Amino acid sequence: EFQRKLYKELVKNYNPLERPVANDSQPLTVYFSLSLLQIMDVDEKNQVLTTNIWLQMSWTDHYLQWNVSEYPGVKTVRFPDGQIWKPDILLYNSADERFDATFHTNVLVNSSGHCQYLPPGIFKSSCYIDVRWFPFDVQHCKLKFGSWSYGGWSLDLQMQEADISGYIPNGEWDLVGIPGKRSERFYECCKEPYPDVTFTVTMRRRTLYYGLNLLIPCVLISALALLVFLLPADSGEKISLGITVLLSLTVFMLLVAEIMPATSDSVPLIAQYFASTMIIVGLSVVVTVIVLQYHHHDPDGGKMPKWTRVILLNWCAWFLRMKPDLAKILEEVRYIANRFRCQDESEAVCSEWKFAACVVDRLCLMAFSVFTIICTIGILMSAPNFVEAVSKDF
Amino acid sequence: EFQRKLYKELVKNYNPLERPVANDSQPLTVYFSLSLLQIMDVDEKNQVLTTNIWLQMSWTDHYLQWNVSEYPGVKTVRFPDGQIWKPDILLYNSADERFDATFHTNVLVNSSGHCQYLPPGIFKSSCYIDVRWFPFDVQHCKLKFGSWSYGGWSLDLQMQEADISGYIPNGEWDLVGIPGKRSERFYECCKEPYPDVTFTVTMRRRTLYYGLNLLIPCVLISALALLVFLLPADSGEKISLGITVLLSLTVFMLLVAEIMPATSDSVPLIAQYFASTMIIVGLSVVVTVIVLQYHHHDPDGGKMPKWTRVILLNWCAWFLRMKPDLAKILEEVRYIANRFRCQDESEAVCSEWKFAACVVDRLCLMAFSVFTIICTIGILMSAPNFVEAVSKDF
Amino acid sequence: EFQRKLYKELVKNYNPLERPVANDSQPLTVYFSLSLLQIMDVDEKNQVLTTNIWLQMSWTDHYLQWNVSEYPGVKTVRFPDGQIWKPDILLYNSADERFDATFHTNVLVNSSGHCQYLPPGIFKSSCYIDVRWFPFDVQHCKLKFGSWSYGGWSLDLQMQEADISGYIPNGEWDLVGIPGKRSERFYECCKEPYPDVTFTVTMRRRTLYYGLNLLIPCVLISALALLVFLLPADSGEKISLGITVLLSLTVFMLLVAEIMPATSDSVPLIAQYFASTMIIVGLSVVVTVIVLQYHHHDPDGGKMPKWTRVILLNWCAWFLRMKPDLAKILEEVRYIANRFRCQDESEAVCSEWKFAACVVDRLCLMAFSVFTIICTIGILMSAPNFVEAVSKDF
Amino acid sequence: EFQRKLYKELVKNYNPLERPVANDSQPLTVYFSLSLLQIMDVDEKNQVLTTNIWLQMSWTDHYLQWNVSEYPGVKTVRFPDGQIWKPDILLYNSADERFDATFHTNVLVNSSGHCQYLPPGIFKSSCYIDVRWFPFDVQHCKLKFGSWSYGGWSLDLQMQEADISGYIPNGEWDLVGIPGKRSERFYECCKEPYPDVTFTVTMRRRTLYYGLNLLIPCVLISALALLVFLLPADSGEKISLGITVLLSLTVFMLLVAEIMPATSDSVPLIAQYFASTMIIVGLSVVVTVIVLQYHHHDPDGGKMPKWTRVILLNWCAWFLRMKPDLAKILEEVRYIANRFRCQDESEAVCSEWKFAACVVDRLCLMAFSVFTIICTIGILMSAPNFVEAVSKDF
Amino acid sequence: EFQRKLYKELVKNYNPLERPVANDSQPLTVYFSLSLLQIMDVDEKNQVLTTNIWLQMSWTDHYLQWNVSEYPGVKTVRFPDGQIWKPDILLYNSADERFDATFHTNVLVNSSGHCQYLPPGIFKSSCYIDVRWFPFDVQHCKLKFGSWSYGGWSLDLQMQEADISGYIPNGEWDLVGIPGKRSERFYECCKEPYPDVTFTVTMRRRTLYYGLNLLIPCVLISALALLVFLLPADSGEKISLGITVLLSLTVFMLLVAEIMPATSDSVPLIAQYFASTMIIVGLSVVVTVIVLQYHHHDPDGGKMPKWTRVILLNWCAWFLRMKPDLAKILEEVRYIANRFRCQDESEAVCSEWKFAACVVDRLCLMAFSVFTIICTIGILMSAPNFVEAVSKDF
Numbered sequence A, B, C, D, E: 001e002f003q004r005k006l007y008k009e010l011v012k013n014y015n016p017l018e019r020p021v022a023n024d025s026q027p028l029t030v031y032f033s034l035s036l037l038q039i040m041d042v043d044e045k046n047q048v049l050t051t052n053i054w055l056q057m058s059w060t061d062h063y064l065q066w067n068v069s070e071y072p073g074v075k076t077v078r079f080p081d082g083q084i085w086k087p088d089i090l091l092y093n094s095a096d097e098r099f100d101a102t103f104h105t106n107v108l109v110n111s112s113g114h115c116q117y118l119p120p121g122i123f124k125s126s127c128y129i130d131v132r133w134f135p136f137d138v139q140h141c142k143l144k145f146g147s148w149s150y151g152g153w154s155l156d157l158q159m160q161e162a163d164i165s166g167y168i169p170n171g172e173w174d175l176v177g178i179p180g181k182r183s184e185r186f187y188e189c190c191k192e193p194y195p196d197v198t199f200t201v202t203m204r205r206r207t208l209y210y211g212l213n214l215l216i217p218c219v220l221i222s223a224l225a226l227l228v229f230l231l232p233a234d235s236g237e238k239i240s241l242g243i244t245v246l247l248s249l250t251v252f253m254l255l256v257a258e259i260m261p262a263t264s265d266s267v268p269l270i271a272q273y274f275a276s277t278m279i280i281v282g283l284s285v286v287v288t289v290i291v292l293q294y295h296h297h298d299p300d301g302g303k304m305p306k307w308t309r310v311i312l313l314n315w316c317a318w319f320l321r322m323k324p325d326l327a328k329i330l331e332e333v334r335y336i337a338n339r340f341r342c343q344d345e346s347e348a349v350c351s352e353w354k355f356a357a358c359v360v361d362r363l364c365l366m367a368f369s370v371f372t373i374i375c376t377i378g379i380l381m382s383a384p385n386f387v388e389a390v391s392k393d394f
């Protein structure tokens, strides 16, 4: 009976259009905060953050007060959308096609006029997602909230610290924090300033998944490329090993292509690693052609230059620790024996060329191994967060 | 005439804003339950569960009572959304972009004021989907329901057991159960506690599909890799077999990549199996290079070390059960015969090196076969539910 | 003037909440049917059917009658949603996120109160799609309609045969029929029974597309695998042909993976066909290694077992219809001649081993050809609808 | 003042439910047309057409007239949805999930009651998309509009020619025309006939994109297959070239698979072209095995049949324009010389077999080249629109 | 008290249907502009631009004025959708399925009747996206705004310069400008003209991402194809290198296929580059077959033509800087010696053919290298914006 009586009394002459202050000249203080429940998605290609949040707004309605003695037991009332004045706070940097994903719930008012409003929502927000250091990256995505049509002279927006006590951890992203800042900005539309409250979600990517699924795979497959410098040339499979690894790594680059944005602010760390690896595998194919060209050198073609004979067979090789009818019969048998001698000297020349190929193959093995290690270590450890990622995730 | 009369009488002074109790100081008891019709989707990558459910709410409306003698034949009435007070129960962990997928239906009230409300819905809910043991996994996805704006002092939410009599089986997921728990929790917003009813859908994945399409394929293709240790070196195809298997298995890992979340809570079982298999195939390629390096060893290069001569040709080989013008003519023919003898001894040296390659090839065949079996069996049987899956699905 | 007068008269005291019967104690008869215009989609992976349907409901409104003499020319009126009582019939097994895809249109009433209501819709429904016999499958998808909040005591739902006179043929699915059944079921919610009308869309898949794009391709590529048993061993390409076919067929399995659900109710027909084919190609690779192992057998290694010498060179081969200074000179020339004789006998031994490989290769060619035909024919003709599909589609 | 006065006067007793005619017995004439702005999408796989259209409806409202002398300057008024009677014209063959994509705009009425209504929309419509001649195809997609609840006795729908003056050309589709037809049809629901206006969008596909990206690529890669019949057998790469082309073309078929519907009304032109090409490449692999089988024929095996010796070495080859101690020493040297003679005759036999392989290789080169040209030209020129496509697009 | 009083006074007799002018004969001036916050997406395949914009409309409402002395402190009021007259300005070339993505916010009115309205939105617009010069392209996408139902005689639309002070840079697109133009156009619907304001977003694509991920990769992989002309023929791997590169580049074309529209207005720059490269790699395979055909030429077949002997061994080779019992014994040994001589001359003939292959291989290396450079440089530098892209992005 008292709840029915109070609801009838409170809506007498109430105008939801009217900002509920007693003195029309002063601004209404609105306290704004949020409660972050979940980070649902970090879409790097579209540059969008999806979160489950509960907005928190609280203010004082001058007209919605009563004396609890005259209504025993009725400490609070509730009003749905449209029957009560509410602040029109929107997320400025919204990426949602409706632009406002807020699910409108009740406003809870107590007997002194304090109004609480806690609409939930699945919010899509635009934030610059920097992939320069991917996958060892930290993202800072802003959520900028503010009254759309009330400037600082009418609505005095005030900030309170974000609530994370209900945050559900994300298996991919490690929540570092969510600080907030209250600013007052001027826009070209209007002489009046408009205040905003901006919360910056700082998140660290967890690198175990990409380490075991992207980085390590690539390292191992690059190592197989260097295996060509150990395969004997007579196997006749040197070129198949190298080009096969190359074809495999090309598909791998395109696999990373599906997850990275097509921006030009910087060459990402992962792009550099794949680049460096690809030229190394490609260069090994070039070297293999050179090695095969020696191993198959015609013994009756040009003559091994002195510069080759010295650099390879001596220096590099040492450094690598390698190292009447009787007369007619005599003319026929002598021709046979002489023919055997000529091929023997010819094949000796071929042995030198084959040995040169082996030396070049051993030389490039050492050089490519060093270069692969240096490029890999250098690129990965360039990231500021690489040491932290190893400690926390591995 | 009586139905028209009763509808006119019941809405006289009715206020949908008003919680329908007689004594404003006491809370209204709302009985909440659900009826699970279908598990529509388990999205492991986005971590979302889609279900077809019928919510069940029932309470007592103090104002919607009548005397059936005064309205003969009118035992029940119905009211749509907005003409009657309803509890504002939402799914807290909703992943739906509207945040509330409930389809609003009628409230059915009988002559004593008992109100029933059974809205259907396609619900999207957020739940941690653990892929540690995939595909032998059991998921526990929670659905947390509660009044949004009425605390424990006004709405007394009470739980009833979930209904599954209409459940339609899912070909992928075996419904284990759906127990419920009623809790009362405090939030930072409000001093008043808020009760919730949470139902935990426990589901077991059916492994036949992934066994025949993911696990067995991989096992067979790994076995082909070990086939290299039986292929003679003179075939000149040892490296093509191995690297081809490797390229195939790389695509297979990326196929599993499209279905798994990118989380770092644990290395999944399937990831370990693919890892172990990949290094085994990759290591077999390394061994093949060593085997070919012996088979193609130059007979005029270094000399077979004693350590090699003993470990391989004796121990390993036993264990494996392998095992004036006349004078001028004499000088020419003697050179020819001597030349033949020199190559003969040379090719004998080559035979030892070729035999060493065969022994190493046989040795690694046994070692790799053992390792492949142990790694496969060990990884699969680590899962707690592996034995159950085999019994129920195979 | 009369149309305006009649609309004013009919809405006097009309209450859309009120079931429009004269006697409140008796149920209102609602005739329900549907008109199927198109089968838009059969999603086997998500297990959802999309159709374009026109629902048909008809009943009698006791209050919406008039005397056409008093309103000359006004034979009918129309009312939109909310101004007239309507049955609240929903599709129970809806897969749509709004749960109700009905587009609300007018209710057409004639001068005796007969009301017709024919809302169109794009309906998404859940149905078990059995892929056991895919692509030779017949699907039975149910559409279950019923009043949500009116039980059998108030709304007497009655069925009429579905209309297909406007059905537009689907190029993929051959509509077999759409019979309907009216049932009355009890639910745990309520003591009152609720009637439903269920229409079962029975559709036959047209197999021409999958025959020419999925089945025949696979058959031809498997045949190329058997081609290895005709390729001479000295070509040095036996292993490349086989493993290449294997890599190709693995991609083909994953292509079928994108269209099939991940259920475990049964191993599909297409899965069995790919399985059988894959082991046959894989087994041919194993046999190729054995054949090469003979063709490259060292003549100075073990000795051809008697069991081999008899089974192959005799039985299998027949069945297959294969089949002072002068003395010093004498010692040098005799050594040369003797050396030639030793290699000659050695290469004769090699010829036997090479012939054994040829016999084994011919033997397995016949065996694999038989097995490929039997497995292919057996699997395809296991389907109950295989004969029908060939007759109608090919 | 006059605009305010007129709006107050016109809505006095206006009933949006009432069809605005003076004589209730006669039908209201509604003129229907459309303005086609853009063809947005032609989805062949889902069989849906997406367009940007402006509907045009015009009729006479008997009640919304005024005397412009009594309201100087007020020549027109406007009414939004729900305040004015409108025809309920829908697109019958809609594929949109809401079923009605019309964006509701104002109705513009002049002082004599003529009402204009031009709602814009993004319309999704179902049309049979025939891919028999793809990519040289012409599509005829219908858009069928009609009043949903007003039959021919109440609403007299009349057609006017479609407007294309604002049409924006589509880079893929060449708009041929959009004629319209007005029909009157009977439905099983109702004895009254219902008129419809149907516009048929006829569009020609532009073939430059598919010619350079789909047809020509395939032609060139098939040509490489025939290159095998020029590669010498001793290269040992004949089988790798052929099977590699085959693997490439299999992926290409699956690429076309992603864009074509899975219907069985006909085998498309593109499917036939890929079919023909695939068997040609596959058959070339079979021939390569035969050629290699001759080139590697054992000289001590069977004897070259007479039928082979004549058909190939003579006919085909001509047509192709190819073409005491002294005695002991004598026995040893005679054995050596005799041994040399035996191999010489043996290798002569091998030369004939190698030449036969060359002849067969040359023969099949000519045959396969002819067949490839004929099949390609025949298939492409079977399309009725092939000549037109070349003239307009190339 | 004054805010409540003013809201009550202003809505007395207010009619939102009425255009708020004092003199009904004159048009109402509406100032239109926009504020561009973000370019969210440029979808080249669907030809759609997605942006985050704030529309700006301002006009004068003759009825919403008051004297601020009579309402101290009340300088402004606000009205939501439907309680105030607003211009019905839509985006004409909308690609959104609702056709109007505007989020409706408040209208802010001051004491002299000046009304401001700044609705935000995520706008999808249709624009021709020219890919002729992709990835060095500049796009000009139009956004055409205008009143839908008010012509130039009633609503006088006037333009103001677009605001970009809040523009957030896009990592892919460099905003060049957003000029606007106000036009007045006649349509077939209506004799009255309708004015529009069109803003043209001009954007330059940033080429770093595609340069490092699309252009450079392709250049390097084409270079590997030319590596075949350095690989010795005896390696037996010439054909595997070439066809492998070809298979890789085919996948690369299909990767670009997923991002380009299927239009026929022009052959894109990227298509030409891939075309040119593909024929070069394919032609190198053809040349390799010719080179191998010489290297494996039978010495007893045809005779090297004079035209070949001169062009290659002399001209091209110079330009390239290449270059009683005793008698019986005599007959046996003489046969042996003569046999050795015959093979010697035979292998000399083979050496010439092998050298010819080497010369042809060297010749084509130079020719293909030149052609690859010219085609690459020519195609890339054909783009008008190529020089600008290098300067700004590299």
Ligand SMILES: *[C@@H]1O[C@H](CO)[C@@H](O)[C@H](O)[C@H]1NC(C)=O
Pocket (backbone or CB within 6 Å): E067, E068, E069, E070
């Ligand atoms: C506004 O009101 C003040 C106080 O009543 C009065 O002095 C002033 O003249 C008014 N201005 C007008 C009527 O323009």
Ligand SMILES: [Ca+2]
Pocket (backbone or CB within 6 Å): A041, A042, A043, A044, A172
């Ligand atoms: Ca992420």
Ligand SMILES: [Ca+2]
Pocket (backbone or CB within 6 Å): B041, B042, B043, B044, B172
């Ligand atoms: Ca699942």
Ligand SMILES: [Ca+2]
Pocket (backbone or CB within 6 Å): C041, C042, C043, C044, C172
């Ligand atoms: Ca289907």
Ligand SMILES: [Ca+2]
Pocket (backbone or CB within 6 Å): D041, D042, D043, D044, D172
């Ligand atoms: Ca198309």
Ligand SMILES: [Ca+2]
Pocket (backbone or CB within 6 Å): E041, E042, E043, E044, E172
């Ligand atoms: Ca873009």
